[PDB]
């Protein structure tokens, strides 16, 4: 019971966690929180210093646990995510347990090196400035001929997603050429430089070292893979292949909330990750200082203290007509997903100038799409395909 001292202010340099706890019947709120701060670690012990409740929800309370600075290894996300929640999810005295937040200190953030490339550094080889990006998911020659005609409508890149590895009908080597030979025939014929994002996933890593040394020999743009079925350990052998090459940046009741998973992933690395609370972590990946917003999931306060930002990816689905709704919410510094590709670039580029006139793009969004049909035939088709469903039942 020396693991619960509410007479204590957590220091300037402490590591500092939260937990949205839910106990079994009759279990007090003050012993479940000492059942968390003690069984995490083992002056070397975490101490639950606050016990705040949650209004109008199933019996939760917010436990504020404060681990010291020296308890952990400098520059490691695996250690921080494992010495904290190792065997704390495995109790039967709790109905649920989530990990809502972590404050890293200023002293421990700048041990890490972070994302290799930021909101500034991305614009060097990427020839797009001040406007968000576009990119759509896609035998072996016929597969190369299809990305040959998606980038020719405005797509800033494309995606070799849905897990295309070397199968006996389509090998790994004969997919790289035919979507390298398909970039050399759309770079000059459209006036911009485009990539095609390609999987590097192999059984070993020695084979994965050959699926990433062949890709960029000097051949090819910035080309990515995932974090699931992989770790912060698996993607450390190749996120630090961007420390030589600048080549892989896109990362594609009872849990751990995404804003803990997003602190773990900026500090690991990468330039634009896939995903009030939707506005919440996208003001953690992009901001410098964030003050405590309890109604946003942002329960703490930590300045990022001069470390490279990281943008966001659109995560709702196909969005061809619902274009100005994304432009306000994710802002300028984000990334979004041949007739069907030329309708995408036109609806994006149009709204951005009607924002800068001063027109309220929230209360006017559809009419900006409609005026862009009178010089673009591919937006004449799309607006009729999408949904005008309403209710005027007052």
């Amino acid at each position: 019971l020396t693991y619960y001292t509410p007479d204590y202010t957590p220091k300037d340099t402490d590591i500092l966690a939260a937990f949205r706890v839910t106990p079994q019947p009759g279990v007090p709120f003050e012993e479940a929180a000492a059942a968390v701060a003690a069984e995490s670690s083992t002056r070397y012990k975490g101490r639950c210093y606050d016990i705040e409740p949650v209004p109008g929800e199933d019996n939760q309370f917010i436990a504020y646990i404060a681990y010291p600075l020296d308890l952990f290894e400098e520059g490691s996300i695996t250690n921080v995510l494992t010495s904290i929640v190792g065997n704390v999810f495995g109790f039967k005295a709790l109905r649920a347990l989530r990990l809502e937040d972590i404050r890293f200190p200023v002293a421990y953030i700048k041990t890490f090196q972070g994302p290799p490339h930021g909101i500034q550094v991305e614009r060097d080889k990427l020839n797009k400035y001040g406007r968000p990006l576009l990119g759509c998911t896609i035998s072996a020659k016929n597969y190369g001929r299809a990305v040959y005609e998606c980038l020719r409508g405005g797509l800033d890149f494309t995606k070799d997603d849905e897990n295309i590895n070397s199968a006996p009908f389509q090998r790994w080597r004969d997919r790289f050429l035919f979507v390298a030979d398909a970039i050399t025939k759309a770079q000059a014929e459209t006036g911009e430089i485009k990539g095609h994002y390609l999987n590097v996933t192999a059984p070993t890593c020695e084979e994965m070292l050959k699926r990433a040394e062949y890709a960029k020999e000097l051949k090819q743009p910035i080309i990515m893979h995932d974090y699931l079925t992989a770790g912060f350990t698996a993607n450390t052998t190749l996120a630090r292949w961007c420390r030589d090459n600048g080549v892989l940046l896109h990362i594609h009741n009872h849990g751990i909330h995404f804003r803990v998973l997003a602190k773990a992933l900026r500090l690991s690395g990468g330039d634009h990750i896939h995903t009030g609370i939707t506005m919440g972590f996208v003001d953690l990946l992009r901001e410098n200082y964030v003050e405590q917003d309890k109604s946003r999931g942002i329960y703490f306060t930590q300045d990022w203290a001069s470390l490279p930002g990281v943008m966001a990816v659109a995560s709702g689905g196909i969005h061809v007509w619902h274009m100005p709704a994304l432009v306000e919410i994710f802002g300028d510094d984000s990334v979004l997903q041949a007739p069907g590709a030329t309708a995408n670039r036109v609806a994006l580029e149009a709204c951005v100038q009607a924002r800068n006139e001063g027109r309220n793009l929230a209360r006017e969004g559809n009419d900006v799409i409609r005026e862009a049909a009178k010089w673009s035939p591919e937006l004449a088709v799309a607006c009729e395909l999408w949904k005008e469903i309403k209710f005027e039942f007052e």
Partner: protein, 111 residues
């Protein structure tokens, strides 16, 4: 989920209940002040939804009649809106009897 639904339902029918507010005022002022009904009918046509945020525009030009519209949210929302529970599910059973019949209308056409 359902709380996403139920909180969306809470504002929709509310704006419908603030319409029967405005209609009760509408038939009331056709008998007491016929100039005030002919001017209330002028503002009524303006196609403005969101009955809660519709009464706020009334306070902008006329801060007084917007209280009589609000008045029946305590007075007529008790003889209209608490009778909703026993009077939805009865109509659900009727639609379980109106519409199951036409599965038989095609079947007799298939007979």
């Amino acid at each position: 989920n359902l709380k996403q639904i139920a909180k969306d339902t809470a504002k929709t029918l509310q704006s419908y209940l603030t319409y029967q507010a405005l209609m009760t005022v509408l038939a009331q002022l056709g008998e007491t002040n016929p100039p005030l009904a002919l001017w209330l009918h002028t503002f009524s046509v303006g196609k403005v939804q969101d009955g809660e945020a519709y009464v706020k525009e009334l306070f902008r030009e006329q801060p007084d009649l917007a209280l009589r519209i609000m008045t029946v949210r305590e007075h007529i929302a008790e003889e209209v809106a608490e009778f909703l529970p026993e009077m939805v599910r009865s109509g659900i059973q009727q639609a379980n009897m109106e519409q199951r019949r036409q599965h038989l209308e095609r079947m007799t056409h298939l007979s």
